[PDB]
């Protein structure tokens, strides 16, 4: 009947809460969701945390180069200091917005560019992540896969 902890980490507005919705549907505040998934044949209780076996999803918006930079500049160190041996998956969110020509163009106008898959993978390597995945919560694209990989990874360590 085995069980897993998923912590979502990443800049505000990078799509964390929305990822959770789609999948499901002054103090610090943490929200915990009890979601059931079937993984490699068998059922698993997920406990997902938003602001025993564990895994961290370091999230960024693929159309926000800042949120990307912060995976490395701000979240990797935080994760590496506190959590020691807890597995990391880098998740690129809002992949639907690469198709968005205006946003791309507004990026291009400030010298920036949308984060590509290949580059997302590089980030993953430079942060010691066990994987890199992408999804769009808007199009329900690949969202369950993210949390299934998450589960597989958490249980495999
Ligand atoms: N286009 C698009 N927008 C999204 C997606 N996921 C979230 N958003 C939007 O991006 C903004 C921030 O979302 P949110 O989930 O609250 O980010 P969070 O603070 O990290 O939880 C909101 O306007 C969301 O509607 C997505 O997959 N595609
Ligand atoms: Mg949020």
Curated annotation (Swiss-Prot):
SUPFAM superfamilies: P-loop containing nucleoside triphosphate hydrolases. PANTHER family: RHO FAMILY GTPASE (PTHR24072). This is Rho-related GTP-binding protein RhoD. Belongs to the small GTPase superfamily. Rho family. Heart, placenta, liver, skeletal muscle, and pancreas and, with weaker intensity, in several other tissues. It is found in: Cell membrane; Early endosome. A motif (Effector region) lies at residues 26-33. GO terms for molecular function: GTP binding; GTPase activity; guanyl-nucleotide exchange factor activity; protein kinase binding. It is a lipid-anchor. Interacts (in GTP-bound form) with DIAPH2 isoform 3, DAPK3, FILIP1 and WHAMM. Interacts with PAK5. Interacts (independent of GTP-loaded status) with ANKFY1. GTP binds at residues 10-17, 93-96. InterPro entries: P-loop_NTPase, Small_GTP-bd, Small_GTPase, Small_GTPase_Rho. Involved in endosome dynamics. May coordinate membrane transport with the function of the cytoskeleton. Involved in the internalization and trafficking of activated tyrosine kinase receptors such as PDGFRB. Participates in the reorganization of actin cytoskeleton; the function seems to involve WHAMM and includes regulation of filopodia formation and actin filament bundling. Can modulate the effect of DAPK3 in reorganization of actin cytoskeleton and focal adhesion dissolution. Keywords: Cell membrane, Endosome, GTP-binding, Lipoprotein, Membrane, Methylation, Nucleotide-binding, Prenylation. The keyword Membrane applies. The keyword GTP-binding applies. It comes from the Eukaryota. The gene is RHOD. GO terms for cellular component: cell projection; cytosol; early endosome; endosome membrane; Golgi membrane; mitochondrial outer membrane; plasma membrane. GO terms for biological process: actin filament bundle assembly; actin filament polymerization; fibroblast growth factor receptor signaling pathway; focal adhesion assembly; lamellipodium assembly; positive regulation of cell adhesion; positive regulation of cell migration; protein targeting.
């Amino acid at each position: 009947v085995r069980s897993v902890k998923v912590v979502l980490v990443g800049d505000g507005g990078c799509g964390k809460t929305s990822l959770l919705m789609v999948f499901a549907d002054t103090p610090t505040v943490f929200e915990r969701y009890m979601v059931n998934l079937q993984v490699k044949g068998k059922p698993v209780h997920l406990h997902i945390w938003d602001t025993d076996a564990s895994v961290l999803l370091l999230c960024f918006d693929v159309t926000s180069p800042n949120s990307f930079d912060n995976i490395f500049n701000r979240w990797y160190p935080e994760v590496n200091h506190f959590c020691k041996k807890v597995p990391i998956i880098v998740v690129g969110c809002k992949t639907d917005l690469r198709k968005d020509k205006s946003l791309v163009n507004k990026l291009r106008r400030n010298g920036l560019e949308p984060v590509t898959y290949h580059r997302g993978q590089e980030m993953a390597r430079s942060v010691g992540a066990v994987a890199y995945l992408e999804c769009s919560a808007r199009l329900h694209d690949n969202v369950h896969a993210v949390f299934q990989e998450a589960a597989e990874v958490a249980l495999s360590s």
